[PDB]
Ligand binder design. Structure first.
Ligand SMILES: *[C@@]12=NC3=[C]C([C])=C([C])[C]=C3N([C][C]([O])[C]([O])[C]([O])[C]OP([O])([O])=O)C1=NC(=O)[N]C2=O
Length: 108
């Protein structure tokens, strides 16, 4: 039902976020001044499973949509489960331009 959504700029090497819904900011606890121009890998931490992470990277590198479940931590430290889904956006000539991801706090 509910879920946040963001846009990452693939034209840039590190895939920084260039847009985030109001839910993303509220959920994560960070403000646009702290997220724009960055990679949401900053929401990851100790419990975060590096193997799951390793899957998004590859999907991205390979430029394929992908969904995985990762443990993320809000700005206050409180952790939460993130059911993330990443989708690539290719130009008419096949090249990838942006990446779109939909986050969902499935902490149940
Ligand atoms: C972040 N959501 C998110 C949304 C998009 C559109 C993309 C492309 C990536 C993410 N990430 C994954 C992260 O940026 C990175 O791709 C992986 O960490 C693998 O690369 P590294 O170089 O860091 O090993 C998001 N990850 C999250 O944990 N939370 C989000 O909301």
């Amino acid at each position: 039902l509910r879920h946040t959504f963001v846009v990452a700029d693939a034209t840039l090497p590190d895939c920084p976020l260039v847009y985030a819904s109001e839910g993303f900011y509220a959920m994560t606890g960070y403000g646009p001044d702290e997220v724009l121009g960055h990679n949401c890998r900053f929401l990851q931490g100790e419990g975060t499973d590096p193997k799951e992470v390793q899957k998004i990277r590859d999907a991205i590198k390979k430029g394929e949509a992908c969904s995985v479940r990762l443990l993320n931590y809000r700005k206050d430290g409180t952790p939460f489960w993130n059911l993330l889904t990443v989708t690539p956006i290719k130009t008419p000539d096949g090249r990838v331009s942006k990446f779109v991801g939909v986050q969902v706090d499935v902490t149940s």
